[PDB]
Write a protein that binds this DNA or RNA. Structure first.
Lengths: 84, 246, 137, 97
RNA sequence: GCUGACGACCAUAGCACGAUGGCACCACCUGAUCCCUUCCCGAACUCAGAAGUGAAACAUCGUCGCGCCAAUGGUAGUGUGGUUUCGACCAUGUGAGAGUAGGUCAUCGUCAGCU
RNA sequence: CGCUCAACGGAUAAAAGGUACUCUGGGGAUAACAGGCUGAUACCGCCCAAGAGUUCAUAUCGACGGCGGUGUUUGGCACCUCGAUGUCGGCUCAUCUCAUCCUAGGGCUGAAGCAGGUCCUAAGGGUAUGGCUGUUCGCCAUUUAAAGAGGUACGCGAGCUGGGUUUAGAACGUCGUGAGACAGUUCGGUCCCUAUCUACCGUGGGCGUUGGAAAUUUGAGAGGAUCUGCUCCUAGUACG
RNA sequence: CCUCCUAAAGAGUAACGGAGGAGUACGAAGGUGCGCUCAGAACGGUCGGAAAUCGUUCAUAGAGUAUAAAGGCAAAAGCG
RNA sequence: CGAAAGCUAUUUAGGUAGCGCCUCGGACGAAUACCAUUGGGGGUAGAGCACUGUUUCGGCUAGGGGGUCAUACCGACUAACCGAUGCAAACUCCGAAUACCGAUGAGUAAUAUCCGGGAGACACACGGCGGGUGCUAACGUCCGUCGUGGAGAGGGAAACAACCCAGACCGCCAGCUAAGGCCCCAAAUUCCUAGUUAAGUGGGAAACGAGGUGGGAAGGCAUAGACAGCUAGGAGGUUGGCUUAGAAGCAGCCAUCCUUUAAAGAAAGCGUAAUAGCUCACUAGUCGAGUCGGCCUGCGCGGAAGAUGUAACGG
């Protein structure tokens, strides 16, 4: 192993996937209880008709059509369920 | 340079005469930006540890040693190109012979020393001590090689050997190299106004005690070299010889 | 031997040097540059070999700019080492060069001695270079 | 020195493929914007533009572009050249008023 | 015409600088008995009020100094088919980011009050 | 409620080793030899020119760097072979390459001559015997015009050998409680095959060659061979 | 087992690939109601300074979030 | 009719099991696919420094690097922040194309889905594309994605599972084409037009070198005699100063001055130890018509050495 410069560097572990992201995209029909976004933190915020879980999960409080918009003074990404 | 060769390792010692200047450790800092293996170089080839392939029955031990010394010579050359000193090779007979087979610049080798002891645990000074006979043999060879320079000067009519001639030539800056027999002292009546070096009688009349030391000083002053040639290479009757610049 | 003083991470992914040098492709500091016509890796030993050569030609009469810094560590596996067992140690630092990038610029020196010095620098470089004058636009 | 000739560049001579195919005919795309009206797209011959670019006063004086008829007083605002080859690839001219 | 409340929108709305406003409204403001306050403090909160003042704050107006927004053109990338010296190129369809010309001292809704 | 059941879908409540005394079933799915791919490394060459060369980069050498060629070292891979492709060295017998060791022809030279140094051309021949060690090698002795570098399954064990490596015995040092182990050492230790085909070396039979026969022959072509020392004279002249 | 990248802008995605953490803690560090806003820099001030505590001016988080990292956090998820 | 060499788990890694993929039957019937228009979220390619770092140059300074008397209070004087400029998998002020998830709508289609009987497979390989690893090495390895092979014949690539064209039900002494080709081996042009090459380049190989050859944009000079040749001169302060043994145009460092001039460098080379000496630049003369040097583009040249035999167009 001339120059002898190699050697073990133990960093060969990782965690399992979490399957996060948008589950139902804009303009889709949705029923109450359907999960819309699984996320870490509030990447998207719960608008009218959308609830927020302890996991930060966004779900439909009532049936309708899911809609995405950037609203508010913070330019936050909101998800709403419009009664349509 | 002292290259210390074994079948197990290689060391590199840089030395000035009887003392060691450095040992080329891993904290030497002339080794910082190296692309070869730095000294001390462990022989960690595949066969030494048992991994890889080619088990003992193939009898590739000689070729493994030859390639290991080739890598050692690569490191030696990469350090030599930056400071270009001559090198002495120290090791077993077969080790230094394998090294001479493989060396990329074998004209920079001055001597090999095969009877040196304690090549792995030994002190750097200890090895330098054991190379002294070879270092003096090389210094003697470097004086035997000056005989041909003296003959070249003589044949080109650029060699002055009379004491007065050498004084004049060294004083007016014409002396390129001075060759003085060991221990040669001469007293003479010197006056540089007329540049007349007449022989002294008793060295008690106002003469210069070391008329040849004055020559040596003038030749060194005018950017020349002085070579002090031993008594058995230089003639007793012609004890001085100056290679002139014209 | 240029090298970053400290890095965020020891090792790097190989990457893919592609595209043209749309930035760092004009003579910006000196009055006279040497840009590249080919791509490749410019190691830190070629930086100091081309930089030492230009310094000896300008002889404390000009100013040299080095528009190329090696900040990408290249690992190398030693001999007698199988594949795997990790990622090899870092041995040198290259800078990624694209066609268009200047490598050196000069200023304050006869245009003949500047051409004669950038010509001598290209000899130590792995690139097909060319000689370019600083312009307005 | 400060007068150059140009040809109108139609909407079928615009875009990535058309500009690449137009440069193969030794023509340089260019746009004339500014003033108080919409920008006009023109095309300059490479050899005339290269010659005009050598004059160092070309960049700091009022230029004249005669597009086979209608004539415009312009100033060169931007000039993108080839990163490696160095030849001009597009010229920005600002209409002066 | 202006003021206040609550919204839409979330910098072309912001920042900065200057000017205007006290009849209403607002704000400072007076006082600390009372309700209620302070790990101390009537600062904030709370109350009882109208001597003073638009000083601050606030609102409105003005501007391009900053910030913000932002083309046209070109370039980079790229789906598909083909070619290639493997860098890229051609056909077709897309097409940025940066930068430039330029724009910007917002724009509306409900209700109440003075005019 | 009781798990480092942490080998974390947890085999049992409960568990280490050695084998060169070994054995069976399999694998070229997977190592050791050789081939193949690759060429990092190695070797060789070229580019630049800091310098060394008393002066002078380029007679000679080429720092820092750059670009290739070869398959040639040390490697990487696991593609072929595990219903077997015998390991190193020696002997015998070779065949090829040229990056030429000698001899041959040259240019430059820091080439006076004699001797060299480099580089070009050149593969026709030639290119030792020994001491030591199993050695290839290497050191050494004495020669030689010279004692070339390589490929050929690191050419060649159905051609020989069997010194080393690498079975079973035994011992030392060392490691192990031990059975045992050691690219540590030491003493000892079965090398089969009557050649079918190809190839090659020789030597015949058959038929053909425009009727047959006895002789003599031409030569399309093929092979062999190709080395070199020393002495004298020119002339102790040229040169010095 | 968790976090980032590899991972090719949905998910997922391997290597003896590159980097780090976990095998807990807390009856308040949970719930609710109410209230609050940080890090720094400069100026002034006894000990006292570069920095303790106090006062002033800027100060969308350059802080904090029990615990790595990522994503979040003003209606604060931060602090009483 | 027709796979798989995948995911998960496993004392598992060449075994096996669930799911994925195949077949058979049943149910269901457009719920499926392609395309057009349209609703979405993204942080990749690219890009860029606004964050985290890294990086170069300049300006600018509290801290630092140094020098008389001077514990004389330590006195006189010599990192940042701004502006240009790059880079990053674990950076992002930005940001596609595709891909994915939906909606609506035509046309075309032996669809999609569910339930049950029977499996096989869980050693994959190469060629692209995007990467990690390796050396942007490997007929290497590990992922993603597509095509082919596997399990696929036919034509082309000389021969050549994986490349290109193309999917063999059988038969025909019929025709048209694809990739590839048309001088002969060997079917089809010694076909036509305009050029390039002189290297058998074509029909291996780079940095680098050269006055090959063709073309294109510009230029400088020229019958006020251009380029080359030949003739004559090429000088005086002065051996510029310094340094150096010597430095006299020509080791090296600092200027590039003046004079007779038609012209002549405080010199572009050779030479000398230093001088000397020979050239050159430059000018005048002679002759007489075009000429000189850079840039870009095409095709060539050298660089180019191996082992059984030409042996690097199949011939």
């Amino acid at each position: 192993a001339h120059k002898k410069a190699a050697g073990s560097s133990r960093n060969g572990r990782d965690s399992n996937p979490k399957m996060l992201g948008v589950k139902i995209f804009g303009g889709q029909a949705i029923v109450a209880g359907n999960i819309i976004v699984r996320q870490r933190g509030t990447e998207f915020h719960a608008g009218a008709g959308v609830g927020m879980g302890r996991d930060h999960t966004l779900f439909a409080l009532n049936d309708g059509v899911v809609k995405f918009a950037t609203k508010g003074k913070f330019n936050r990404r909101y998800v709403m369920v419009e009664e349509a | 340079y002292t290259v210390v060769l074994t079948r197990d390792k290689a060391r590199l010692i840089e030395a000035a005469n009887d003392r060691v200047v450095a040992e080329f450790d891993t904290d030497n800092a002339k080794q910082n930006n190296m692309e070869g293996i730095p000294f001390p170089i462990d022989n960690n080839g595949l066969y030494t540890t048992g991994d890889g392939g080619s088990d003992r029955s193939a009898n590739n031990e000689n070729s493994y040693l030859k390639e290991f010394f080739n890598q050692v010579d690569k490191s030696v050359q990469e350090l030599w190109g930056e400071h270009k000193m001559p090198l002495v090779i120290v090791g077993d007979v077969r080790n230094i012979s394998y090294y001479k087979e493989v060396c990329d610049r074998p004209e920079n080798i001055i001597a090999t020393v095969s009877n040196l002891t304690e090549l792995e645990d030994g002190n750097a000074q200890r090895i330098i001590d054991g190379v002294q006979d070879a270092v003096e043999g090389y210094r003697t060879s470097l004086h035997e090689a000056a005989l041909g320079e003296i003959d070249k000067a003589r044949g080109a009519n650029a060699l002055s050997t009379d004491l007065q001639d050498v004084y004049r030539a060294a004083f007016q800056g014409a002396g390129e190299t001075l060759y003085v027999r060991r221990g040669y002292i001469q007293a003479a009546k010197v006056d540089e106004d007329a540049q007349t070096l007449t022989m002294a009688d008793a060295a008690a009349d106002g003469v210069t005690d070391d008329a040849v030391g004055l020559i040596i000083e003038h030749v060194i002053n005018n950017g020349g070299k002085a070579v002090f040639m031993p008594q058995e290479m230089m003639s007793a009757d012609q004890p001085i010889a100056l290679v002139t610049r014209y | 031997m240029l090298q970053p003083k400290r890095t965020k991470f020891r090792k790097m992914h190989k990457g893919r040097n592609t595209g043209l040098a749309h930035r760092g492709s004009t003579v910006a500091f000196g009055q006279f540059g040497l840009k590249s016509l080919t791509r490749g890796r410019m190691t830190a030993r070629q930086i100091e070999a081309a930089r030492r050569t230009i310094t000896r030609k300008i002889k404390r009469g000009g100013k040299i700019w080095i528009r190329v810094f090696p900040d990408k560590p290249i690992s190398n596996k030693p001999l007698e080492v199988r594949m795997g067992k990790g990622k090899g140690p870092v041995e040198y630092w290259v800078c990624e060069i694209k066609p268009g990038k200047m490598l050196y610029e000069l200023e304050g020196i006869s245009e003949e001695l500047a051409r004669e010095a950038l010509t001598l620098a290209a000899a130590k470089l792995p690139f097909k270079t060319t000689i370019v004058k600083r312009t307005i636009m | 020195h400060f007068a150059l000739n140009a040809v109108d560049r139609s909407a079928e001579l615009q875009g990535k493929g058309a500009s690449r195919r137009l440069r193969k005919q030794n023509l340089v795309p260019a746009i004339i914007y500014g003033g108080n009206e919409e920008p006009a797209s023109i095309s300059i011959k490479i050899n005339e533009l290269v010659k005009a670019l050598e004059f160092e006063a070309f960049f700091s004086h009022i230029l004249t572009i005669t597009v086979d008829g209608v004539e415009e007083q312009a100033v060169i605002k931007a000039l993108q050249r080839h990163p490696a080859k160095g030849f001009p690839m597009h010229a920005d001219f600002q209409r002066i008023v």
